């Protein structure tokens, strides 16, 4: 149904030129510069007709973006110029030659209910020519697609190790940290790791630190916090209009309180929070019961940091575990209060958890796929009916309220899916991100990729009133994909370049929460580059990508209209917003290729279970070839460069220690380092 | 066809009693007492009616025969004993629920002809509490055998780790193996390492080794070995009788020679052989194109050379590659002067030609398998026509040729794949039997079991005359693999104690080729435990236990048989004979968890292949289970215990090298490695 299509794609080009509009009217003013220039202050580069910027990001080359945001940044956004790398011949030889077999001559807006049509290219039999060429095609795409990854992979561990070489002194190249110190009755954590340490590792180590356990601590802390912005913006309020509320600490929920001043009140609260805080100070420095074990460790050189890293140290391989460790802003310290032990039962739990969730969740991918040619309940038929309702409206619908309620649908879910890598427990950041974009990109993949489909399959003539059955029902698939890649793919990147919650909330508390200056950097919040979700869309366009690349070639313009219009707006974006929250130097680029990897051969697999419906067609002596090809191949490519990515080689360190001592014979790298790790909550 | 396992089983008891027999004869006898008393000798312990050793064998305990042979014959023994502790409890309540379901009432020698027989546990279409209660054996067989593999890896780890702990000083714990330096066109590979590890491991580095490459030399001085040996027995033959021969060079292929006196030959041609030894020393000495681009580094703690063993040296993980190093005696110096660039062309090479043998050897064993009731050819019918013919020596017949045939077409295969391996290129012994081993049992899985139920399956009634096939096919495959399990199982063991082939070579040794005294340790030779031969036999053996445990427990008693009696047979020869080659403290055994574990896999899909026949007979909800359930414990016993076999903690190198520097404070470690590794051909 071509006209659905263009009418969608239609409102959504206008809707995104229209926002492109609103954003070069907010951000040419400058008495809101602050928010959608959040950097150039925090990098402390600045103080105090529209399309012109298109150019202007396109300016600025590599290295230079790599030392203004960070390499993490900048291969995040070389994804999207890898995609387009896979696709631009994708798209050229697909068109080419996919449509030229003999919009010419292809589906044409078809049903399989045409059992009298029986129009030229429709069905399997023989085919002989068609499917020989689609099986070619099929082959030469993933030949290049390998090709691409491989380049792009061994750019990715080139870049690496240039950096992490050229990459000045951190706090955490040389901490370790040690997972599960077996109790001792007499000694205390801090002493056994002494012990072992000076005993195990000599000449090189230089001193540790014990993990505490203020969790309860932080929470206060935090609550203090909160607290101490309600008093800012109530005495706002009455400084601003004098009059005092009787709110009951809630205002909404808030009962019969009489709060006749509320300034005595948030006064004598704040006293109390703050001595009970110095109460759970003092405990909480003067308790072994919350001492955990686990320390961070520090050495005197990176070659002996990175040598206790990669290697176990107790027979007991649940005793005594080593990793690397993060930079004290990278992590998070409420999860080094789970001991060791409940680990396991916690993500098995968190594996309940997601599957649950994953099976409710098709009753909204159902409830979606409703967007057929059935209409509201008969009762509201005055409400529902009007002096036409089925002529062009219809395509609006069907090309418009499928994406937006999918879209709206899929709101929570990266919140959810954090919570869930968050309460599984991993104490970093850059894994709590990469789990979560893992479990993202695998609902994706269950849900709102194959119970769309299958559900889709189902609807219209009832499963064909009880292989062939998809074989017929995959095009019209492939128009809601083109639907759906419309409105979170074009008006998505839109929204986001927009950046309209992170504008409001700062109004808000310019307006209300701040009282005088310096709060600014404090009330400024540039976000995070997002990775949880940036990462599990990308990977869902080249799964959808690949596995209609040689069905239906249709799909793949709006995938490269996607890929670049996300390129070049992520690259502002990078540029003058989101700063990286955390620096894990191109940690999850073989997450990537894996993924690529695994898109790839479900490809491979759901093209074999089309072609292969015609049995003994001489079809399945190569197709199958074909997946194992890309496991082989990615294996090929796992252990040929994975080693940069996964594990830190030594000569690079002796190389990093000789030149910094070279240069700084004269660094004090214990006091440098002893303070480091303590608590955020601990000065 | 009981009668056929009647007779087959006592021929065979039979044999074994006869080969028992005349082993006491044998031993008896002091004067050979040398080779069924090679040990002892050895070690250095001695100089110079019937099952009464049986009790002997089972006396020493444990500790000290790992003292006396190593912990490798250990382990390699307790396998026998690990078998028994699985199949124990498989054949007691395998018979005991299997056959009183209700050889009371059983197949009873039953054949799928039977169309009109119709007898009562015969087929599968419902089958409800007889096919449940077949599930639940499943379920507990595979749960006993975890538990039991789970112990017993425990076990061997706590092994290894308190053997390598006692273990005293070797000159492989410290050095290293480094592969692929990469060339330089000044600097030679030596001082390349030099500069490498001095500035990369400091205070550690103690010294290297550059490999060369003198395979041709290794092969002119076997060359001039053998030709001694010949010389040896020619000049015993003539001072036995005097005369002289005309035999050029060969005897059987010798050509027309004179050879009137041949003494002044043989002395000739050593002083040639012997003079060009001398200048091609001269020049392997004097070439720098010999060296090879590794070389045997070695430490001055086992700390450093385990964290040097254990981690990445260059940025390039295909350059400098470093792995731990065996003995001087353990290395095979000929697969140094390989290079690795074409290490990955030889194993493809060898896969291709794994495969064509795996394939043409369908052959043999489709020649084995014509073990019916078809006779040789029509033309020879008085020589193949007797009296009977036909009444009991076809009895003995299918219970006997089977099992002979089938053990003589797999005699050179060990062979041939210690070929395979070697040309592969290892360099250590331990590493070439352990890949020959899973070679043959890969061998073993696709051929010699699953090609001959096929091919079964396929004689009789001729594939059923163009799951239901196999589901009547299974118990005479159990009959063939009753004969064999016989004719390779306990005949094989008698065999094997009875030591025919090194006594023959020994006495013609002493016959004609000693001399003199002192030669005896050379003339004797004790062999080797042959773990590629050894441990491929008993993983088929679980194989086909496992695999047919709750099918026909039938089969389960000859298994018992032959592990108690390979246990005691062993025990003894590897007290008295079979010293270790090398030594490698409980390498394999996650091998055999891995090879396990496989084979039960392989049962439990069998299974499924035989009861899921009826479609939703409401069994596969469970059968799929049990496949995933076993390689998730698999996995959890991997990440378990594995590292103890796979990778060196640094804890125990500390420990052990703090009691060893407290043991001899004065031990000169460069001099006592210096000289090691250097080559064997070079003193």
Same mark, same amino acid.
């Given at each position: ?24 009217? !907010?951000? %040419? ?6 928010? &959608? ?9 600045? +103080? ?24 993490? *940044? ?7 110029? !890898? ?18 077999? @003999? ?24 085919? +002989? ?17 390998? &090709? ?17 070489? #050229? ?75 004098? #009059? /005092? ?52 460790? +520090? ?19 649940? /005793? ?92 929570? !879910? ?13 104490? +970093?950041?850059? #894994? ?12 994706? !993949? ?17 499963? *064909? ?37 992170? %504008? ?23 976000? #995070? ?9 990308? /990977? ?7 596995? &209609? ?6 799909? %793949? ?15 502002? /974006?990078?540029?003058?917003? &989101? ?27 759901? %093209? ?66 002893? @303070? ?8």
């Amino acid at each position: 149904t071509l006209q659905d299509i263009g009418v969608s794609a239609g409102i959504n080009i206008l809707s995104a030129f229209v926002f492109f509009i609103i954003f070069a009217v !907010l951000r %040419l003013q400058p008495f809101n510069d602050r928010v &959608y220039f959040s950097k150039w202050y925090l990098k402390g580069l600045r +103080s105090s007709k529209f399309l012109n910027w298109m150019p202007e990001a396109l300016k600025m080359p590599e290295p230079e973006l790599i030392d203004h945001a960070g390499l993490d *940044s900048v291969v995040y956004l070389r994804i999207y110029w !890898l995609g387009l790398k896979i696709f631009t011949p994708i798209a050229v030889l697909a068109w080419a030659v996919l449509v030229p077999v @003999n919009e010419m001559a292809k589906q044409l807006r078809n049903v399989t209910s045409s059992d009298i049509d029986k129009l030229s290219v429709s069905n399997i039999p023989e085919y +002989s020519m068609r499917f020989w060429t689609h099986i070619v095609m099929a082959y030469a795409f993933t030949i290049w697609t390998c &090709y691409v990854l491989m380049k792009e992979y061994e750019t990715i561990a080139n870049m690496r190790l240039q950096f992490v070489a #050229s990459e000045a002194r951190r706090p955490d190249q040389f901490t370790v940290l040690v997972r599960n110190v077996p109790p001792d009755a007499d000694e205390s954590v801090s002493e056994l790791v002494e012990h072992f340490f000076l005993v195990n590792h000599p000449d090189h180590y230089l001193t540790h630190q014990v993990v505490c356990n203020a969790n309860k601590l932080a929470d206060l802390v935090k609550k203090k916090k909160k607290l101490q912005n309600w008093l800012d913006y109530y005495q706002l309020k009455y400084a601003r209009n004098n #009059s /005092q509320r009787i709110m009951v600490k809630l205002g909404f929920l808030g009962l019969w309180g009489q709060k006749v001043d509320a300034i005595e009140h948030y006064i004598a609260e704040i006293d109390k929070i703050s001595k009970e805080i110095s109460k759970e100070r003092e405990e909480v420095v003067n308790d072994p019961k919350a001492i955990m074990p686990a320390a961070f460790v +520090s050495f005197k050189t990176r070659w002996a940091a990175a040598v206790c890293a990669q290697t176990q140290q107790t027979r007991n391989p649940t /005793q005594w575990l080593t990793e690397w460790a993060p930079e004290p802003r990278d992590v998070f310290w409420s999860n080094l209060a789970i001991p060791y032990v409940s680990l396991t039962v916690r993500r098995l739990i968190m594996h309940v958890a997601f599957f649950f969730l994953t099976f409710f969740f098709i009753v909204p991918i159902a409830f979606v796929q409703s967007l057929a040619t059935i209409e509201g309940i008969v009762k509201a038929a005055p409400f529902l009916k009007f002096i036409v309702d089925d002529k062009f409206m219809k395509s609006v619908i069907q090309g418009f309220l499928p994406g937006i309620a999918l879209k709206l649908f899929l709101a929570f !879910l990266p919140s959810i899916l954090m919570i869930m890598s968050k309460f599984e427990g991993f104490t +970093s950041i850059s #894994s709590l991100e990469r789990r979560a974009a893992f479990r993202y990109y695998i609902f994706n !993949l269950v849900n709102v990729f194959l119970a769309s489909v299958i559900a889709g399959a189902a609807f219209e003539q009832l499963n *064909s009133f009880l292989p062939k059955t998809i074989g017929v029902a995959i095009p019209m698939k492939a128009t809601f994909f083109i639907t759906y890649i419309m409105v979170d793919g074009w008006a998505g990147v839109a929204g986001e370049i927009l950046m309209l919650k992170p %504008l409001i909330m700062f109004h808000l508390k310019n307006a209300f929460l701040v009282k005088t200056d310096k709060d600014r950097e404090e009330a400024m919040d540039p976000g #995070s580059i997002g990775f949880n979700t940036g990462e599990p869309r990308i /990977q869902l366009y080249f799964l959808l990508g690949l596995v &209609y690349a040689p069905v239906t070639p249709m799909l %793949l313009p709006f995938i490269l209209v996607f890929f670049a219009l996300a390129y070049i707006v992520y690259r502002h /974006q990078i540029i003058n917003v &989101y700063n990286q929250e955390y620096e894990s130097a191109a940690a999850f680029w073989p997450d990537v290729h894996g993924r690529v990897i695994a898109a790839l051969v479900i490809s491979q697999l759901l %093209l074999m279970g089309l072609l292969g419906t015609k049995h003994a067609a001489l079809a399945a002596p190569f197709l199958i070839a074909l997946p194992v090809l890309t496991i082989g191949f990615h294996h090929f490519c796992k252990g040929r460069y994975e080693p940069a990515f996964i594990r830190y080689p030594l000569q690079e360190a002796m190389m990093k220690d000789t030149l910094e001592t070279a240069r700084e014979p004269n660094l004090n790298l214990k006091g440098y380092l002893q @303070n480091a790790y303590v608590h955020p909550v601990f000065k």
